From Swiss-Prot, chain B:
The modification N6-(pyridoxal phosphate)lysine is found at residue 197. The gene is BCAT2. Its main location: mitochondrion. Catalyzes the first reaction in the catabolism of the essential branched chain amino acids leucine, isoleucine, and valine. May also function as a transporter of branched chain alpha-keto acids. The modification N6-acetyllysine is found at residue 289. This is Branched-chain-amino-acid aminotransferase, mitochondrial. Ubiquitous. PROSITE patterns: AA_TRANSFER_CLASS_4 (PS00770). It comes from Homo sapiens.
Amino acid sequence: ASSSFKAADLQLEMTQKPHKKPGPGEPLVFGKTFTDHMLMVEWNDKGWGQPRIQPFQNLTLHPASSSLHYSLQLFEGMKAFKGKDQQVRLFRPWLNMDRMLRSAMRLCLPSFDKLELLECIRRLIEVDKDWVPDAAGTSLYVRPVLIGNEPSLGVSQPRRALLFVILCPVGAYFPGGSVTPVSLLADPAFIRAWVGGVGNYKLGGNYGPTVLVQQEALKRGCEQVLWLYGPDHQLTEVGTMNIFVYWTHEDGVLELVTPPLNGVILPGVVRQSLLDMAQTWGEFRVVERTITMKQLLRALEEGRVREVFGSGTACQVCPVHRILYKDRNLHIPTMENGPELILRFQKELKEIQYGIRAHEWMFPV
Amino acid sequence: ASSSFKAADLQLEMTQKPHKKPGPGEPLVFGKTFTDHMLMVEWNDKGWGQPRIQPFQNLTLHPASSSLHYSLQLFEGMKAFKGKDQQVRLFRPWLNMDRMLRSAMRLCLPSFDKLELLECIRRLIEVDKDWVPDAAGTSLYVRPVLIGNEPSLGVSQPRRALLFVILCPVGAYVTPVSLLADPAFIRAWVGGVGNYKLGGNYGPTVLVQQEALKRGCEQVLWLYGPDHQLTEVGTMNIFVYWTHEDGVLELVTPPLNGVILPGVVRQSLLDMAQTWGEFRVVERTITMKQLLRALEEGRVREVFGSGTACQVCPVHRILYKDRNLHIPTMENGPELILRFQKELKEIQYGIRAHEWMFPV
Ligand SMILES: CC[C@H](C)[C@@H](NCc1c(COP(=O)(O)O)cnc(C)c1O)C(=O)O
Ligand SMILES: CC[C@H](C)[C@H](NCc1c(COP(=O)(O)O)cnc(C)c1O)C(=O)O
């Protein structure tokens, strides 16, 4: 018993003022450059309306829209890569569709068919193929969004909603192969999410309270925030990335560990891919288990820690070299291990994402 | 002064297509009906633009507006009451202005001068005075809102923002409510943002409120900790009038520990009760164990919620997991509830002169 919204029904309108691309690899600050078209689907009493694809344009919302009063909003983030030159592929889009639908049900927003949305996104990206860069480490960021849109102040299940997708060409997250480490502020006073909360869904509500904390991290000399949880001070996620630790655990076994999906952390697509990939190799233990600051401190001085990094769509595998804890700067030996594992993960993903290696994880055009 | 828009700069555009005021039938559903005008002020690199009272109209937002991607949004809720004379008064608006500014700083949104916003709100209400109902227990609900509005996908401090205010005539709200108290749902946490009126606090409650209904309750009593403590109920702070374990008669309400929204009505009930001096008034943690045990022992007199929508709201039942708990509120006259309600109406409708009220 559930909705619809079909891809066979798209309508099409092309831009009369096709904006001009970034040119050489120089500008494009992430998220501030948009392509010529966008996807838009409306839902109401008559259910889902028809998809289509229109020129990039402003939204028109009633002043009481629940999307602005009660944060009835959720989003996704995924990437399209252009490799064999002009051939464009989406990395594991199905997982983002699965996650988006779960976020929708948590916020009582309308359900939709994951494959139809994926096909409309495919159609949209097709129209803006030329916006997809092909220089090393660049890609096209895809931002689907679903918002409640009830022109009513009652806190309740909306009877109207809007789904849209916009695209941004992105530069190489790292200047040029320059994989550079980041420093993290790890302060227990800051709490991103709670057990029983909504940290495991991609809801706008989870992000707004982090702006002030990120500003604090900069003022204290760090680049991102390492979110801690519990009296235990466990490591949950870093910034907008899941966190991984490669070290010789306390029982002498070499392992790659990452916090488990206990409800407080976001099930990252890159996170799942690194786990899958490492399990496949079978060269060392790969496990999902709780990581505490106390365990990290001990391992660091017995020189048991090899590499620590974050994973996410923006920055696939991100080295960490320093963590400021309790006034405490902890040097993380990641780079002196020449991010061997980090480097290996990056290479495999590049080969897969840019079509060098055929793989089911990729979705065509 | 630099850092704020000014009431003296107000530009105003009267409507050329009035709405029909709520007809005779009189069915006033909350937040469903809007008056003719709204307030709008923009902020950016050049800072605050000039305030504007304009016809009620849609907002035009860039698809990447941070208000829609990262919930850079907050709001307020307060009421204007029209008394016998026909004079309109705002109830303790300064507290809402203070709370709105605290919410803005928490979300790195632009600061503004509280008195200037209050004056523009005063001017907006004046324009739409004809919308302020005057039948018993009716009022005009005021909804200021401040949202981030940078056309960028980066999660960061916006360089653009929009502040607007819309008004709704409200038709009323006695009768007790039932509450669902289930530990599985967590609304806010220590170190979180439950003490700010941010839209992000509300969206996740929709599903839970739907669950409360399918379970036969009308609202949600939010619990927190192993420590099943009572935080707030629905969109109201929660109060308990009883004889405590120490056998002393008191009025208790959970403390402002970051744990909950500092309600304006809540602060007013505390002030008023403290003033009377007839019984102990305190801010302390309240646990389900203590409640269960106080009920068991007939020490509980009245339990109620407080909030702008429903000033003092009697509670008669709480479903705690399987456990339907009857709350003796109505059989104890809501004696304290009635006295609070009596006093607030006299103050809010101008029967009794008071500093809590702000003119027109
Ligand atoms: C502005 C967009 C969001 C910051 C963002 N999400 C990535 C994310 C991740 C990584 O998830 P994936 O990109 O799906 O692998 C993990 N944890 C949190 C709290 C996150 O926010 C992104 O799309 O990059
Ligand atoms: C639907 C009503 C609005 C959300 C609103 N605040 C009510 C409220 C309150 C009570 O605050 P007051 O209205 O200021 O007394 C307490 N806790 C929560 C979680 C609330 O939402 C208001 O001031 O109208």
